[PDB]
Amino acid sequence: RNTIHEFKKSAKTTLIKIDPALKIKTKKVNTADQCANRCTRNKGLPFTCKAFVFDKARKQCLWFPFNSMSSGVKKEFGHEFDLYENKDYIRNCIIGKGRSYKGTVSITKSGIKCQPWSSMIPHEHSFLPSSYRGKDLQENYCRNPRGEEGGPWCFTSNPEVRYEVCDIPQCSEV
Amino acid sequence: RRNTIHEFKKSAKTTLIKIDPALKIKTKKVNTADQCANRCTRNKGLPFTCKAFVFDKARKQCLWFPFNSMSSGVKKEFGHEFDLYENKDYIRNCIIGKGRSYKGTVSITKSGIKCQPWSSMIPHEHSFLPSSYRGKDLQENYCRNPRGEEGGPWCFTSNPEVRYEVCDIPQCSEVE
Numbered sequence: 001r002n003t004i005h006e007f008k009k010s011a012k013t014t015l016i017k018i019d020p021a022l023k024i025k026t027k028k029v030n031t032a033d034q035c036a037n038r039c040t041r042n043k044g045l046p047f048t049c050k051a052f053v054f055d056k057a058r059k060q061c062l063w064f065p066f067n068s069m070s071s072g073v074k075k076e077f078g079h080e081f082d083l084y085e086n087k088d089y090i091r092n093c094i095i096g097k098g099r100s101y102k103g104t105v106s107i108t109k110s111g112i113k114c115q116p117w118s119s120m121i122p123h124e125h126s127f128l129p130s131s132y133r134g135k136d137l138q139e140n141y142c143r144n145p146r147g148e149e150g151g152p153w154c155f156t157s158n159p160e161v162r163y164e165v166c167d168i169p170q171c172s173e174v
Numbered sequence: 175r176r177n178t179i180h181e182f183k184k185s186a187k188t189t190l191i192k193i194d195p196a197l198k199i200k201t202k203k204v205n206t207a208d209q210c211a212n213r214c215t216r217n218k219g220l221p222f223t224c225k226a227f228v229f230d231k232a233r234k235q236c237l238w239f240p241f242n243s244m245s246s247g248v249k250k251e252f253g254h255e256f257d258l259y260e261n262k263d264y265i266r267n268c269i270i271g272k273g274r275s276y277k278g279t280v281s282i283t284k285s286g287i288k289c290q291p292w293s294s295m296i297p298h299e300h301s302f303l304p305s306s307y308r309g310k311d312l313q314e315n316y317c318r319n320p321r322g323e324e325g326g327p328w329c330f331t332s333n334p335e336v337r338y339e340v341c342d343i344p345q346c347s348e349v350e
């Protein structure tokens with residue numbers, strides 16, 4: 001029963017533990033799925049498994065008690081790496097205008113699937129990841145790169161509808 | 175067509191009734207609740223963001239919704255033939271204050287110990303019966319803070335040696 005799908009994947013990335021206080025359980029393994037379930041089930045791990053980098057080359061897992069947003073770590077490239085962040089630890093509600101939203105919702109308020117940011121079709125635009133470094137304009141996730149009034153949005157996969165806001169809840173709704 | 179049903183928090187014998195006559199809904203006769211789930215996760219052919227769905231077992235019908243139990247203008251109701259499945263991307267996964275209202279599904283203590291089900295007395299015997307904390311959602315082995323104590327969500331651990339331990343659930347300030 002694999003669970004990688006409940007992980008937000010960042011291809012060719014990895015985190016750096018430059019603070020020796022939080023650990024990093026490392027282990028030899030065959031597939032990334034194996035890293036997934038061990039993190040999801042939190043088995044043999046002395047902490048809350050929040051993220052995991054699977055080293056494609058040396059074929060092993062790096063179970064982390066933190067993720068790319070933890071105050072202390074840093075993320076870098078490597079074609080041989082794949083980062084997986086447990087979604088329970090990626091905030092799923094927005095605060096304010098959602099400029100910091102790094103969730104994975106990729107459907108607009110009307111239910112239309114979002115167009116990938118790196119794509120110019122069906123809608124040509126200038127919100128390239130390259131122009132909005134730090135904004136995580138990855139995949140087709142709803143984002144608010146310019147932090148505008150309106151909240152997270154995305155260009156839609158429907159040719160007739162250029163963009164639409166997404167239906168992401170404010171954290172302050174009780 | 176992978177079964178997406180596990181990415182939903184299930185509340186058995188529960189359905190949602192919309193108090194706001196304007197909330198959208200879409201239904202359809204299917205065969206299994208797995209069908210409701212896959213369609214809800216893919217958001218295929220639904221005119222809103224699918225945040226939850228109810229499977230009517232008596233009619234074998236999916237009721238897809240753009241709201242969940244925590245939405246305003248909606249009410250929970252008991253029902254033998256209904257099961258409620260809530261999409262986890264819409265159940266707040268951080269806590270405001272002490273976490274009294276936390277309804278997420280984290281079931282692991284901050285030390286990595288799997289929680290003990292609330293309705294179980296093994297390994298730890300306790301007086302936290304769900305029935306006496308209605309509205310508290312003491313279901314499964316989810317980390318909860320029924321009495322709203324400082325220190326936030328906690329659970330009885332399945333470690334016979336550790337009676338209970340708090341959970342590692344981030345503040346939405348932003349735990350830092």
